[PDB]
């Protein structure tokens, strides 16, 4: 099948910029790609026909090229209405694929997360479980590094993340980290560490504490 | 040109995911239509279409798991997809072949859990991170099915500073957690509460911090 590689990742601008998004086929596809832009919990809304064809109800900063295995979606100067995902579509071979698609954020000053590290609660202890949970809240970029240690060993299995989407406010992100034990193993060792690594500084923010004690 | 999905939210592993797309404004027979799915992490599926006359095309990675019918007298056209499995739990939508016109699209979830109530932890600082200007407290559900949960801190009287994280699946039960951050020097003093609503299991709990 084709695969299309969208690129890059995520890009972050500021309304009034003007970006532009690739989209690489795995195969020569010709003009057979479309450009599809979807909002939070709203369905996918079509932008361009075969490569760069405009679609009437579009505004006019959106327009596409390319040809062959490379394609550019362009948005000359970018609203704040424009940001959320963007996809192009392979109609050229079958089965139709969709690239890996591009999110369109908006650029903020960076901002340092702040964290918070809770021990497993009373009642759940009883139950025989023990979540050890971290928050990491209002910081940018998204991209965050998050490691949980006990008694100085990094432990990566029982660990669930969750990142809430970009504030509609602050423009920040916000994440929890969760590390799941049963009560057996929490009560077998005695440091528990939240540690968690951002762009905004080389050294790491550490968040622990001692069980019982405290 | 109007679409509409519809059809049951749950389906059972092994069982079939029936959908239905609801025309309006045109006439399937004037028109060729599809199917697409999006999947957890953005991922898009072309899983196949139906052309003005009845014919059809499949994606093979569905492999005659799936059937596209139609019936121009009510001008509707359907989606089967037999013996689904979790991987099969996906927004579901119905679009104009061209991707001219879409559904607003509908959620499926596949699993084989049953209605359970979440169990609703208060999440307390250590003694030893409560020195600051400001203090986060917290609220752990976990082990409910299915979704949604609604979670709100005094009632709602609580908003600002509130950071509620989207719910992940744990043990074929789904998990969620909440941070609410408040001036220090009101709490304990200033009570707060959390409070979750889970409508399937027509259970409510409030759990003081």
């Known amino acids: 099948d084709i695969v299309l590689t969208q690129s890059p990742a995520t890009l972050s601008v500021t309304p009034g910029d003007s970006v532009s998004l690739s989209c690489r086929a795995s195969?020569?596809?010709?003009?057979?790609l479309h450009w599809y832009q979807q909002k939070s919990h709203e369905s996918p809304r079509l932008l361009i026909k075969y490569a760069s064809q405009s679609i009437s109800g579009i505004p006019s900063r959106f327009s596409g090229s390319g040809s062959g295995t490379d394609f550019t979606l362009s948005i000359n100067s970018v609203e704040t209405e424009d940001f959320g995902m963007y996809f192009c579509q392979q109609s050229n071979s079958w089965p139709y694929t969709f690239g890996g698609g591009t999110k369109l954020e908006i650029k903020r000053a960076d901002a340092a997360p702040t964290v918070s590290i809770f021990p497993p609660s009373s009642e759940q202890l009883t139950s025989g479980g023990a979540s050890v949970v971290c928050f990491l809240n209002n910081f940018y970029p998204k991209d965050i590094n998050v490691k949980w240690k006990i008694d100085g060993s990094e432990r990566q299995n029982g660990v669930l993340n969750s990142w809430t989407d970009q504030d509609s406010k602050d423009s920040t992100y916000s994440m929890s980290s969760t590390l799941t034990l049963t009560k057996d193993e929490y009560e077998r060792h005695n440091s528990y560490t939240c540690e968690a690594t951002h762009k905004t500084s080389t050294s790491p923010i550490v968040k622990s504490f001692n069980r019982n004690e405290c | 040109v109007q679409l509409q999905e519809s059809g049951p939210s749950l389906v059972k592993p092994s069982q079939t995911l029936s959908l239905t797309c609801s025309v309006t404004?045109?006439?399937?027979?004037?028109?060729?239509w599809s199917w697409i799915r999006k999947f957890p992490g953005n991922k898009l599926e072309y899983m196949g279409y139906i052309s003005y006359s009845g014919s059809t095309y499949y994606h093979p990675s569905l492999k005659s798991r799936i059937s596209i019918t139609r019936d121009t007298s009510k001008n509707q056209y359907y989606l089967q997809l037999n013996s689904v499995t979790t991987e099969d739990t996906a927004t579901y939508y119905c679009?104009?072949?061209?991707?001219?016109?879409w559904g607003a699209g509908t959620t499926v979830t596949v699993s084989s859990a049953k209605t359970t109530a979440p169990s609703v932890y208060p999440l307390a600082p250590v003694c030893g991170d409560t020195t600051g200007s400001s203090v986060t407290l917290g609220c752990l559900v976990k082990g409910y099915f299915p979704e949604p949960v609604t979670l709100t801190w005094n009632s709602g009287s609580l908003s600002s500073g509130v950071h509620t994280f989207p719910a992940v699946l744990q043990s074929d039960l789904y998990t969620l957690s909440s941070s609410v951050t408040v001036t220090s020097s009101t709490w304990p003093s200033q009570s707060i509460t959390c409070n979750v609503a889970h409508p399937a299991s027509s259970t409510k709990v409030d759990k003081k911090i």
């Open positions: 679009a104009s072949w061209g991707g001219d016109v």
């Open positions: 195969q020569s596809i010709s003009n057979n």
């Open positions: 404004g045109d006439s399937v027979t004037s028109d060729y």
